[PDB]
């Protein structure tokens, strides 16, 4: 049966194990992977 | 002989019943028309009755001498044999008074004769059958919309050989009579006017015939599709909203991005109607007293 | 007139015709309501119009439409996502609480009327119009459900006159407590019937029509909606149903 | 957003094998398994109006053109804007025609409204195909095709449509027009067959399907009912296309010659063979 | 009050400023003066 | 009813002022005198 | 748990620890951080 | 909270970026004057 | 259950809570900018 | 299973590499100035 | 009997020899052959 | 009975002064021989 | 029984020969040579 | 009988005359010589 | 008692005054012999 | 009764001085003779 409070579902403790391990890790496993890959993209080839 | 009851439709026939009574008539409609009970399990099977008054048979007659006038100009060249008639039931031809005659009816039988009669009678056949759909919705208590999509339909009939070939003044400016003669004429108004592609009044009328099948490919689908429930009865699905406005009114909003009222699905369907030969009548009343060559129209009001 | 004039009484007088038309199709259904009974997000760029007077065909009142829109009928979906978007699931079994694929509504107790002073849909033992009196005539044969097993025996036809048509196929149970079932889904070939919607042990869950001759417009909602209830779920998950529900052609 | 009665209808599933992984209702629109597919198809497709806007010429969809390949390159590819880049637009178009007519089933199996709708777009699937696949695979190369534009494929159908003389002599074409003018022939009275009963002229009691049987039997002598003209809209609107895809599946690939020269196969009959009669005589 | 997010803010609202942003990154590339990276060869 | 609130400003109003902005620009960016974008050199 | 009336849902604190905690991620990474992209923009290149 | 984690957090990023990256490539390929293979053909 | 008669809402005292939170102040500063970000642009570039 | 292994990547990735394979076959096998197997006649 | 007596004689008087005479006059007046009333002027 | 007594002689007779009459009017009008309104000065 | 005595020989026989005589007359009549009503003057 | 009276008595009087009149009032004005309203002039 | 009265008086009153004038206007509006508004100086 | 009143005699009294007024203003402006709002240079 469905419950009540904040917030469901779910699922404490899963504010820092579910919505931060596969949610805030995206702000890294590609957001910074852009910054390194752009060192081989930004200069090819806007300068002829 | 018994009427059977086969497997999966199904059907039951009807004894002796007609419709309703108010402003119609009693002793005019003929005997109970004989029923076509021949695998009539799909749709209906019931001939008659029919309002055979002088508001309908004025088109049976005025259509018939529209039917016989080009008729006695479809046997005129054959050779007086029944061999060449059905041989050239189409290859035969007849044109109105010449591109130089016009306002005078002094023309005899030959060069351009049997054009002046067919339409003259047809004139009170079409116009006497605009009002076999406009007043038989008054014999009960309905509306007039049925011939207001028809006043729009005889708006394209209001220009072809009527309003333009009299102001300008000539009968060649009306349509030749036959079964191919006018097909060598639908491409005439094309090329003489420099092609009517840059004529987005003839082309939007097109554009209003490409929304008759964007509007009835699916109506004939979904009303047959929500009919297991109860959407076939279009006379009990609007003011008392049934579940047919639930399998057909959640179905399209999710899909294309909007649905419609059981009544409003007959408000667009008659808005891609009173706008086909209406935008055709204008886009053919704008062709001949505005800019003929429409290639010399759609590059000065189009790209320039 | 001119070469540049008439295309403007159109980019204007009709540039609001998707606008005027849409609202006239957005009468029923609207306003938009949330997933509980709440003044919802909005309506749209073509908001619903305030309705005009509606006169009814057999004096059924001042039923203006859009009309009744609130929460009269019982609904039973346990809100999985309290957020608006993600779907909801019934309580026990979905074919008892009436939620999901099987839909109905609560209406007034006056059945659909024609104009003769009588009701619309009646059996063949309510209209001695067309009968059986030549050769051997098939109105009485056994059937089969979606479980691929015999379901009952249909021996009658609910007649029609204005459409000269049919709407139901009445089933004589072992007992007699009434049941009903739609008309277009059916798929009969030879000497036995096959329905591919409901199993042959879920036919009593279809309401007994309060009268075996009358169908009130109140009743004509679940009676042609329970079969739609079995066109969504049926049937998890393995074996025979996979060679029954899927594939096919017609 | 959702409607007022859109409460009970909300249930997950509809999709086939895999789960309810893609079926999230983004707004008033349905994003089922073929929902995000069309999201993938509609996003790339707006760029296909803009690609040959730097290769062919103009940037406005007035004259934007990604031409079909040439006639003779074979069973293969093309240049680019003149075929190659044209060769990519179709499988999106058609890959988007498909992901739409079949995302409806994720609603059809979701509820229980009938499967005659994954079908009325399949006469549009079998009407756009006859100009992109059905033709130019056999006569040489993919060069027998039309341009995608809105004013380019215009001067492609007329001043470039008299290859077969006149196309009115094309009998099925003209029968697939003996089928088309009849679509709004039966939407014009059926879109007005439910309008004027609650709004008769103003005030009057509403009509039932017995006044329908004293208005249309008081019209044109044939009253197949109200379910005989939804079997009289889906009879006006799907078939003017298979009588046109048959007006062209034996036109050009077998008859790239004058179809105005087809109407001399009719006057040739042993009875009236050596005989010039009328007009012809 | 009202309104919804947990559904919208993951696959819905992201294509609103995406409907505002990338629809105009193209344009600043069509102009033969702005461009900001196009005119490189010459 | 009639006029609600908390949905229009998120996905509709952001492209209403933008829609009120777009059919204005491509004429004043292209008037015989104005423009104010491409011309900055001469 | 199901609801009935205005204006759930809603509601709280399914609105407080949720809706307050995700919307500003779309109203800051694009409101003032979008003026951090204005860096290599406001000077490059409105002035030629 | 809510949304998804075992369902729609590894797939709202797979074909979503494929719906924003690999079809964004077709803009930097709509070039044939730049282009990483059409430089020679100029 | 939903709501009662005209209008609800409405309502007194419920006409000023959501028709006045992003519908009054979200238009006045939009009008102020129609005065502020317009009066500084009432001079360039009409005069050359 | 976070991602779906015998679903999203067993017959849906085999056409995901089929996604980027043949659409480019109509760009690189195309190009108005390459070919290098077709023009064995001119 | 078999055809109506007091009906198809008052109203059929102008549908029987009226579908008939209207197309027998147009031949005895096939122009350049007869005249007799068009001789007046000439 | 059947034969429209207070009808066909009121309305259908009021239009047969147009059905029988005017179809032969628009022929002998422009006939030069009779003229009687088209003689003119010569 | 079997053969119609009332119907066919009175109302369907008046159209039996009508089918056989009306289309058969419109062949032998007004040939440019025979005529027997046109050349009774030429 | 077969028909009533006192309603179509305003439409066989109001507009019925002009159905005949509109097709007859304009077979005369076409002549540049008559006109009666154009010639009473120069 | 056969047709209508109330409808003809408020809406079908037009096909007597307007759609009988507005079409006959542009006829005598285009005629030089009258002009009124095209008088000015000629 | 008759026709709509709280519907038709108000909101349709617009096209009386709109659709009628617009397509009669359009002609009397574009005429070589009128202009009236074009005369200034003298
Ligand atoms: C060069 C080729 C041009 C072109 C050349 C032309 C020309 C020329 C014309 C059209 C016109 C039209 N074109 Mg175009 N057209 C092109 C492309 C197309 C295409 C397409 C390929 O997609 C189509 C489908 C069409 C078809 C159309 C129509 C949309 C439009 C006229 C409608 C019509 O036929 O009403 C016809 C309906 C009526 C006239 C009303 C009929 C009702 C009557 C009054 C009732 C009679 C009563 C009688 C008694 C009933 C008896 C029945 C008995 C009981 C049996 N064109 C290209 C671009 N086209 C026509 C037009 O008007 O342009 C706007 C026209 O002249
Ligand atoms: C079949 C013979 C000719 C042809 C004959 C005609 C004739 C005649 C007409 C058209 C017209 C049109 N044709 Mg074409 N057309 C052909 C090929 C096609 C094909 C195809 C790929 O097979 C399609 C899908 C279409 C459909 C179209 C539309 C683009 C356009 C208006 C349709 C309409 O109003 O009716 C209903 C259809 C709709 C309401 C759908 C709307 C179609 C719109 C215009 C197309 C959308 C493109 C859009 C601008 C791009 C947006 C993408 C991003 C948002 C930027 N044509 C072939 C080559 N076509 C009409 C026109 O002139 O256009 C204004 C017209 O009169
Ligand atoms: C020379 C002039 C010739 C002529 C030139 C041609 C040419 C060329 C063609 C035809 C074709 C046809 N002609 Mg022709 N034709 C003439 C004039 C006419 C007239 C007329 C009354 O004037 C009519 C009624 C017709 C009718 C016909 C049909 C027999 C046939 C249409 C097939 C078709 O379109 O289905 C196809 C159906 C579709 C394409 C719809 C498919 C829908 C798809 C799946 C969805 C598209 C979505 C879209 C991309 C998105 C837009 C919407 C946006 C989101 C807004 N022609 C004259 C006689 N005609 C076509 C044909 O016969 O081949 C089949 C054809 O190529
Ligand atoms: C050479 C740079 C151009 C320019 C071309 C672009 C392009 C391309 C974009 C923006 C974008 C932005 N620009 Mg800018 N922009 C310029 C000057 C302006 C001016 C002004 C004249 O004061 C205004 C009101 C704007 C408007 C805006 C913002 C709405 C937006 C940045 C914030 C955001 O992420 O949302 N720009 C100069 C003239 N602008 C982004 C956007 O609209 O996404 C929402 C974007 O992609
Ligand atoms: C000196 C002239 C200024 C300028 C004068 C104004 C004025 C006045 C307004 C804007 C406004 C806007 N400007 Mg500016 N703007 C300029 C030219 C541009 C150019 C361009 C094509 O170069 C762009 C992309 C923009 C961008 C924008 C929009 C972000 C914004 C319109 C609000 C809306 O979306 O509704 N401006 C030049 C740089 N612009 C409107 C705004 O929102 O206020 C800032 C507004 O009132
Ligand atoms: C010298 C020749 C006379 C003339 C010779 C006759 C004869 C003979 C008859 C009429 C008859 C009539 N004439 Mg006259 N009539 C003339 C030519 C015309 C012209 C015309 C187009 O100029 C018109 C409008 C009429 C008007 C009419 C009708 C009112 C009337 C037909 C009876 C009916 O209503 O059915 N005549 C000229 C002026 N006309 C018929 C009648 O009954 O008169 C009252 C009749 O027998
Ligand atoms: C420019 C003025 C034109 C003119 C153009 C119009 C127009 C337009 C109308 C009339 C209308 C009328 N005209 Mg006037 N009319 C003129 C001269 C005439 C002459 C004549 C020459 O003797 C006649 C017999 C008529 C006939 C008539 C009346 C029947 C009617 C005015 C009263 C009424 O409404 O009923 N006109 C002059 C030559 N006439 C009105 C009408 O008949 O419909 C109600 C009407 O709309
Ligand atoms: C005989 C079949 C008739 C028919 C039926 C029909 N059309 C239908 C449907 C049905 C049942 C729908 O259910 C569906 C609909 O949504 O209802 C309107 C639809 C539809 N008919 C449409 C258009 C249409 N149908 C047409 C014709 C017909 N439709 C036939 C007459 C035509 C014309 C005039 O030929 C057009 C223009 C769409 C509005 C809609 C299809 C919705 C859809 O499937 O969307 C998928 C598309 C995308 C996701 C976009 C991706 C595509 C690419 C990104 C670009 C495509 C390139 C291409 C060249 C586009 C160019 C368009 C024009 C410039 C040609
Ligand atoms: C909005 C535009 C669309 C449209 C609308 C439209 N069409 C309409 C209407 C409307 C509103 C009608 O109200 C009217 C109608 O009643 O529909 C059934 C009609 C109609 N449109 C029709 C056809 C039609 N539709 C067309 C198309 C369109 N019409 C568009 C799709 C076209 C085209 C493309 O030009 C045509 C030709 C007819 C079915 C019908 C017209 C009814 C009519 O006027 O006929 C009068 C009756 C006769 C002439 C009877 C005479 C019969 C023959 C002429 C004599 C020979 C037979 C006779 C039996 C001899 C045998 C002797 C016997 C006595 C034994
Ligand atoms: C066995 O054969 C028998 C004996 C039965 C006779 C057969 C006859 C035949 C072959 C009949 C064939 C009929 C057909 C098929 C006709 C086809 C017609 C077609 C395809 C199109 C016709 C369209 C109608 C047109 C072009 C009419 C145009 C006329 C107008 C728009 C207005 C005309 C108005 C005029 C002339 C003014 C008259 C009015 C006044 C007030 C003077
Ligand atoms: Fe309908």
Swiss-Prot record, chains A, G, I:
One example of a Gene Ontology biological process annotation: photosynthesis, light reaction
Keywords noted in UniProt: Antenna complex, Bacteriochlorophyll, Cell inner membrane, Cell membrane, Chlorophyll, Chromophore, Light-harvesting polypeptide, Magnesium, Membrane, Metal-binding, Signal-anchor, Transmembrane, Transmembrane helix
Gene Ontology MF, one: metal ion binding
Transmembrane segments: 27-44
Spans within the Periplasmic topological domain: 45-48
Coiled-coil region(s): none
Entry binding sites for a bacteriochlorophyll: 20, 38
One CC-aspect GO term: plasma membrane
Residue ranges that the UniProt entry lists as topological domain Cytoplasmic: 1-26
Membrane topology, record value: Single-pass type II membrane protein
Top-level taxon: Bacteria
Main location as per UniProt: membrane
Compartments (UniProt record): Cell inner membrane
The protein's assembly and partners: The core complex is formed by different alpha and beta chains, binding bacteriochlorophyll molecules, and arranged most probably in tetrameric structures disposed around the reaction center. The non-pigmented gamma chains may constitute additional components.
Protein's job: Antenna complexes are light-harvesting systems, which transfer the excitation energy to the reaction centers.
Family: Belongs to the antenna complex beta subunit family.
Protein name: Light-harvesting protein B-875 beta chain
Organism: Cereibacter sphaeroides (strain ATCC 17023 / DSM 158 / JCM 6121 / CCUG 31486 / LMG 2827 / NBRC 12203 / NCIMB 8253 / ATH 2.4.1.)
Curated annotation (Swiss-Prot), chain B:
Sorted UniProt keywords: Bacteriochlorophyll, Chlorophyll, Chromophore, Electron transport, Iron, Magnesium, Membrane, Metal-binding, Photosynthesis, Reaction center, Transmembrane, Transmembrane helix, Transport
Record field: transmembrane: 53-79, 110-139, 142-167, 197-225, 259-285
Gene3D superfamilies assigned to the protein according to its UniProt record, in alphabetical order: Photosystem II protein D1-like
Source organism of the structure: Cereibacter sphaeroides
NCBIfam families: pufM (TIGR01115)
Membrane topology annotation: Multi-pass membrane protein
Binding site for a ubiquinone: 252
One GO term describing the cellular component: plasma membrane-derived chromatophore membrane
Function of the molecule: The reaction center is a membrane-bound complex that mediates the initial photochemical event in the electron transfer process of photosynthesis.
Main location group: membrane
Positions annotated to bind (7R,8Z)-bacteriochlorophyll b: 182, 202
Subunit-level organization: Reaction center is composed of four bacteriochlorophylls, two bacteriopheophytins, two ubiquinones, one iron, and three highly hydrophobic polypeptide chains (designated L, M, and H).
InterPro entries documented for this protein: Photo_II_D1/D2_sf (IPR036854), Photo_RC_L/M (IPR000484), Photo_RC_L/M_CS (IPR055265), Photo_RC_M (IPR005781)
A Pfam family it matches: Photo_RC
Coiled coil ranges: none
Designated name of the protein: Reaction center protein M chain
Encoding gene (name): pufM
Subcellular location: Cellular chromatophore membrane
Similarity annotation: Belongs to the reaction center PufL/M/PsbA/D family.
Amino acids binding Fe cation: 219, 234, 266
GO process annotations (BP): photosynthetic electron transport in photosystem II
GO MF: bacteriochlorophyll binding; electron transporter, transferring electrons within the cyclic electron transport pathway of photosynthesis activity; metal ion binding
UniProtKB/Swiss-Prot annotation, chain C:
Domain of life: Bacteria
Cytoplasmic side: 22-250
Entry's transmembrane regions: 2-21
Broad class of where this protein is predominantly found: membrane
Protein's UniProt name: Reaction center protein H chain
Function recorded in the entry: The reaction center is a membrane-bound complex that mediates the initial photochemical event in the electron transfer process of photosynthesis.
Topology relative to the membrane: Single-pass membrane protein
Similarity annotation: Belongs to the reaction center PuhA family.
Cellular component, GO, one term: plasma membrane light-harvesting complex
Record-linked InterPro entries: Bac_photo_RC_H_C (IPR014747), Photo_RC_H (IPR005652), Photo_RC_H_N (IPR015810), Photo_RC_H_N_sf (IPR037097), PRC-brl_dom (IPR027275), PRC_barrel-like_sf (IPR011033)
Organism in which the protein naturally occurs: Cereibacter sphaeroides
Alphabetical list of NCBIfam families matching this protein: puhA (TIGR01150)
Protein location: Cellular chromatophore membrane
UniProt keywords, alphabetically: Bacteriochlorophyll, Chlorophyll, Chromophore, Electron transport, Membrane, Photosynthesis, Reaction center, Transmembrane, Transmembrane helix, Transport
Pfam families cross-referenced by the UniProt entry: PRC (PF05239), PRCH (PF03967)
GO biological process: photosynthesis, light reaction
Quaternary structure (record): Heterotrimer composed of subunits L, M, and H.
GO MF assignments: bacteriochlorophyll binding; electron transporter, transferring electrons within the cyclic electron transport pathway of photosynthesis activity
Cofactors required: a bacteriochlorophyll; a bacteriopheophytin; Fe cation; Mg(2+)
Disulphide-bridged cysteine pairs: none
Cofactor-binding details, from the entry: Binds 4 bacteriochlorophylls per trimer.
Curated annotation (Swiss-Prot), chains E, F, H, J, K, L, M, N, O, P:
TM spans (from-to): 9-29
Chief location: membrane
Places the protein is found: Cell inner membrane
Keywords in alphabetical order: Antenna complex, Bacteriochlorophyll, Cell inner membrane, Cell membrane, Chlorophyll, Chromophore, Formylation, Light-harvesting polypeptide, Magnesium, Membrane, Metal-binding, Transmembrane, Transmembrane helix
Gene Ontology cellular-component annotations: organelle inner membrane; plasma membrane; plasma membrane light-harvesting complex
UniProt superkingdom: Bacteria
Record-listed a bacteriochlorophyll binding positions: 25
Keyword hit for Ligase: no
Topology term for the membrane: Single-pass type II membrane protein
Keyword Cell inner membrane: yes
GO molecular function, one term: electron transporter, transferring electrons within the cyclic electron transport pathway of photosynthesis activity
BP-aspect Gene Ontology terms: photosynthesis, light reaction
Assembly and binders: The core complex is formed by different alpha and beta chains, binding bacteriochlorophyll molecules, and arranged most probably in tetrameric structures disposed around the reaction center. The non-pigmented gamma chains may constitute additional components.
Role of this protein: Antenna complexes are light-harvesting systems, which transfer the excitation energy to the reaction centers.
Sequence similarity: Belongs to the antenna complex alpha subunit family.
Designated name of the protein: Light-harvesting protein B-875 alpha chain
Native source species: Cereibacter sphaeroides
Entire protein: shown range: 8 to 49 of 58
């Amino acid at each position: 049966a469905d419950k009540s409070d904040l917030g469901y579902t779910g699922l404490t403790d899963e504010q820092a194990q579910e919505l931060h391990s596969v949610y805030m890790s995206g702000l890294w496993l590609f957001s910074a992977v852009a910054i390194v890959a752009h060192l081989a993209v930004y200069i090819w080839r806007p300068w002829f | 002989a018994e009427y059977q009851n086969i497997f999966s439709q199904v059907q039951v026939r009807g004894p002796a019943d007609l419709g309703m009574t108010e402003d119609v008539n009693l002793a005019n409609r003929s005997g109970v028309g004989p029923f076509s009970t021949l695998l009539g399990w799909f749709g209906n099977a019931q001939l008659g009755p029919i309002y055979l008054g002088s508001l309908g048979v004025l088109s049976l007659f005025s259509g018939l001498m529209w039917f016989f006038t080009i008729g006695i100009w479809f046997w005129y060249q054959a050779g007086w044999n029944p061999a060449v008639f059905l041989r050239d039931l189409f290859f035969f031809s007849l044109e109105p008074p010449a591109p130089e005659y016009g306002l005078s009816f002094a023309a005899p039988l030959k060069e351009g004769g049997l054009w002046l009669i067919a339409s003259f009678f047809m004139f009170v056949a079409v116009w006497s059958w605009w009002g076999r759909t406009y007043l038989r919705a008054q014999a009960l208590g309905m509306g007039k919309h049925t011939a207001w999509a028809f006043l729009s339909a005889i708006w394209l009939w209001m220009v072809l050989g009527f309003i333009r070939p009299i102001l300008m003044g000539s009968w060649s400016e009306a349509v030749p009579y036959g079964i191919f003669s006018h097909l060598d004429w639908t491409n005439n108004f094309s090329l003489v006017h420099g092609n009517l592609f840059y004529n987005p009044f003839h082309g939007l009328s097109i554009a209003f015939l490409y929304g008759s099948a964007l509007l009835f490919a699916m109506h004939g689908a979904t009303i047959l599709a929500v009919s297991r429930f109860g959407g076939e009865r279009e006379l009990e699905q609007i003011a008392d909203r049934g579940t047919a406005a639930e399998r057909a009114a959640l179905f399209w909003r999710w899909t294309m991005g909007f649905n419609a009222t059981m009544e409003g699905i007959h408000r667009w369907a008659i808005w891609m109607a009173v706008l086909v030969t209406l935008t055709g009548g204008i886009g053919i009343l704008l062709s001949g007293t505005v800019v003929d060559n429409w290639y010399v129209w759609g590059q000065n009001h189009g790209m320039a | 007139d001119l070469a540049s004039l008439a295309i403007y009484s159109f980019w204007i007088f009709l540039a609001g015709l998707i606008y005027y038309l849409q609202t006239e199709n957005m009468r029923e259904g609207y306003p938009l309501e949330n997933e509980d009974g709440t003044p919802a997000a909005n309506q749209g760029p073509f908001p619903l119009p305030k309705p005009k007077t509606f006169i009814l065909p057999h004096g059924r009142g001042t039923l203006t439409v859009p009309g009744p829109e609130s929460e009269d009928r019982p609904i039973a979906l346990a809100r999985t996502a309290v957020s608006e978007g993600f779907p909801h699931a019934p309580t026990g079994d979905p074919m008892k609480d009436g939620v999901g694929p099987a839909s109905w509504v609560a209406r007034r107790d006056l059945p659909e009327l024609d104009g003769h002073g009588h009701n619309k849909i009646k059996p063949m033992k309510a209209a001695a119009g067309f009968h059986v009196s030549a050769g051997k005539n098939p109105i009485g044969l056994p059937v089969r459900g979606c479980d691929l097993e015999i379901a009952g025996k249909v021996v009658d036809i609910w007649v029609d006159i204005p459409e000269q048509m049919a709407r139901f196929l009445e089933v004589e149970l072992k007992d007699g407590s009434t049941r009903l079932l739609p008309m277009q889904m059916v798929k009969v070939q030879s000497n036995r019937v096959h329905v591919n919607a409901l199993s042959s042990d879920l036919f009593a869950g279809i309401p007994t029509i309060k009268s075996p001759t009358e169908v009130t417009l109140l009743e004509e909602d679940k009676i042609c909606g329970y079969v739609a209830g079995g066109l969504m779920y049926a049937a998890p998950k393995r074996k025979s149903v996979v060679a029954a529900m899927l594939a096919e052609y017609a | 957003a959702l409607l007022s009665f859109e409460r009970k209808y909300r249930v997950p599933g509809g999709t086939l094998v895999g789960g309810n992984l893609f079926d999230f209702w983004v707004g008033p629109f349905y994003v089922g398994f073929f929902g995000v597919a069309t999201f993938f198809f509609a996003a790339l497709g707006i760029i296909l109006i803009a690609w040959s806007a730097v290769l062919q010429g103009t940037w406005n969809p007035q004259l934007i053109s990604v031409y079909p390949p040439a006639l003779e390159y074979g069973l293969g590819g093309a240049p680019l804007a003149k075929g190659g880049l044209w060769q990519i637009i179709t499988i999106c178009a058609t890959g988007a025609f498909v992901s739409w007519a079949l995302r409806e089933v994720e609603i059809c199996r979701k509820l229980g409204i009938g499967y005659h709708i994954p079908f009325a777009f399949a006469f549009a699937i079998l009407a756009y195909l006859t100009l992109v696949l059905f033709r130019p695979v056999m006569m040489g190369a993919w060069g027998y095709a039309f341009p995608y534009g809105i004013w380019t494929h215009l001067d492609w159908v007329s001043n470039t449509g008299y290859t077969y003389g006149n196309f009115h002599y094309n009998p099925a074409h003209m029968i697939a027009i003996s089928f088309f003018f009849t679509n709004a022939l039966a939407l014009a009275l059926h879109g007005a067959l439910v309008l004027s009963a609650a709004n008769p002229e103003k005030g009057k009691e509403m009509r039932t399907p017995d006044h329908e049987d004293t208005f249309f039997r008081d019209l044109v002598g044939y009253s197949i009912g109200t379910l005989g003209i939804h079997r009289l809209g889906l009879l006006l609107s799907l078939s003017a296309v298979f009588f046109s895809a048959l007006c062209m599946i034996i036109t050009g690939t077998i008859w790239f010659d004058q179809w105005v020269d087809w109407w001399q196969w009719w006057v040739k009959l042993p009875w009236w063979a050596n005989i010039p009669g009328g007009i012809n005589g | 009050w009202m309104i919804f997010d947990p559904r919208r803010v993951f696959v819905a609202q992201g294509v609103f400023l995406f409907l505002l942003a990338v629809m105009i990154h193209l344009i600043l590339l069509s102009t033969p003066s702005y461009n900001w990276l196009e005119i490189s060869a010459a």
